[model samples]
Target: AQYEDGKQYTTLEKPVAGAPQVLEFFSFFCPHCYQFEEVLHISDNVKKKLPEGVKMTKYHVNFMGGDLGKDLTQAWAVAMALGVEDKVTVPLFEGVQKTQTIRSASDIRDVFINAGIKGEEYDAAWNSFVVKSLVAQQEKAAADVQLRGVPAMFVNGKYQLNPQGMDTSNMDVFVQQYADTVKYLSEKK
Candidate 1:
């Protein structure tokens, strides 16, 4: 429900916009989601062959505004709010679930600083209507999608199984294929 035509995930609200090919539904805690990020990034080049309107907007799933969920949302959205999302994107995830270190709030705060995102603005945005709304939005999306394991993508309302489910040892194969599937499916709508 977070992605209704005019609401949160709806990039369509911009009026002069191209339709999205699919949603990259994911989460921070999910190990699979982390692995898929690398795969998805490379696949973006292949997607250039598709009809120009197709793009991927990742939905970082949160199960409502639980304490940790709010913190995670606050971190990412605040960075996004400051327009430094482009710079800090990978670092943000590395701060969390890194093999060498466990993520902490302080590390996230530092990431904001490194990206030129203002701390006060990040703090202020947490309590703002826009960010709070997204926090609520992600929770609902998590529930609605019934995500068993993460890094699952969906096109329109359909869940993308991502290749012959579990046949390939590497998820990257599915990740690469997903862009093609989404572009093809976009026309199916």
Candidate 2:
């Protein structure tokens, strides 16, 4: 908890905090998150029950390794920049899940297009400053967190590794515990 303090880049991104936050930490490369998409997909009932001001922050960690992390992260930033995140996020999720090819900018762009994004808008978002900033912020986040893998998370900069210590074969269980952990942390002093 203390380690994350004085860390993290507060530019181009900031933790959403009006009420408790349900951060859906994920990675484009993680097949589990793809498979678990249905679980993360918010139902109207879930939305209605959320605490006032609660927000779901979808964080996509880049597993491209080396400098590729930036490339991976920028893709997400572009979605927000192009104002097509809600429009394309799910398609991208399904694309990664349904296809075996699952990686690369062009492939991701193709998914965005399949989701009905206009050619010019997709292209512009892909090449735009939003994506660029996303990449840059991801770079900063990686350095700040020094996290070892994708699908890991920190709810409001709190919650350390679990008893299993972030390496568990049961992804669904781990994520559930992580969610519980975050919820506990959020309600803490």
Candidate 3:
């Protein structure tokens, strides 16, 4: 949270509109994002401390596409649209990282099913124009940010944790740094 020159994270040229935006750029197939579910403590800390006016959103990255990144991104977009992200995020990560499955849209739909989504609901959301539109939007967003990697968090749509400064090997240090940054940026409003 230090504001020292060259120490603080960089700010974006244009900030996102509406409520303080806390965005996580991630991919379900990314190993780091998988480790981050627990190690980075993104979910627990964000849930417990985030202020009421803030909106935390996850942007699924499609950088590594020859695999199922594109499909998973579509599924993630649908889940977010259907408001089932909290239910599917962790399990979807587990299914990919641990089980090593989840290669297609059908597989992703199965994960949604296991997350208690009904077949009809899945069909509707998966095929909806809204979700498809959002998937396109997600790709544009990734390009807009010039994102090259996963597990990048943007606070208030402007500032980001200084990634190179982040100590990735230690879980506690990483989590504390993230928590502190989120708190500091969130309180600025």
Candidate 4:
């Protein structure tokens, strides 16, 4: 993986130090993000190739759907806290991006209920301190990054992936290249 700084990636002003980590900043209402997650399965493919001890974290951005943006982020936090991100992610994405069925917090809660999460459990996690803290933290990170768009990937919180830097002509090649770049960046000291 031959990457050039400023072309392949931009060094972050506030780089985080610790174990290798990938922080993905995305928004549920973004069509491109939906395609990246559901159609391309970028996260799944990248996760399989990540080295041991490297953590991949997803942060929902709150700048897309007006008031619903914060609600959706809260919904995501609750799902993560309860370990049901897999079950609700696709449905929530579809609801917000395709079906347009989710209009309020109650609508978001219904998606969890339909995914087999009990009402009380959903309520508990939604209102819990951990979930609230997670939501706040994600919001803060989003602001700190001064993000301009959705579906941005940051390697180790220092290098931001440049989609245009990879070969996107072929899906297979693109995924491999993307994963390789992430792996290469993760190993950087």
Overall lDDT per candidate, in order of appearance: 0.54, 0.53, 0.74, 0.82
- What's the candidate order when arranged by decreasing lDDT? 4, 3, 1, 2
Tens-digit lDDT track of model 1 for 62-181: 653244545766666665566665476667666666742425566667667667767776667766888777656555555555655556555554434344433265555544455545
State which candidate has the highest lDDT.
Answer: 4
lDDT of 2 at 65: 33
Q: What shift in Å separates residue 15 of candidate 2 from its native position after superposition?
A: 13
Per-model C-alpha RMSD: 7.7, 7.0, 2.3, 1.7
TM-score of each: 0.70, 0.63, 0.87, 0.92
lDDT of 2 by residue, 5-51 (tens): 22221111333333224444465556665544555432222334445
TM-score winner, 3 or 4 = 4
Model 2 weakest 10-residue run by lDDT? 3-12
Model 3, runs deviating above 4 Å: 14-20, 167-170
Measured with C-alpha atoms, the lDDT of residue 143 in candidate 1 is: 59
- Top TM-score prediction, candidate number: 4
Model 3 TM-score on a 0 to 1 scale? 0.87
- C-alpha displacement of 57 in model 2, angstroms? 2.3
Model 3: lDDT equals: 0.74
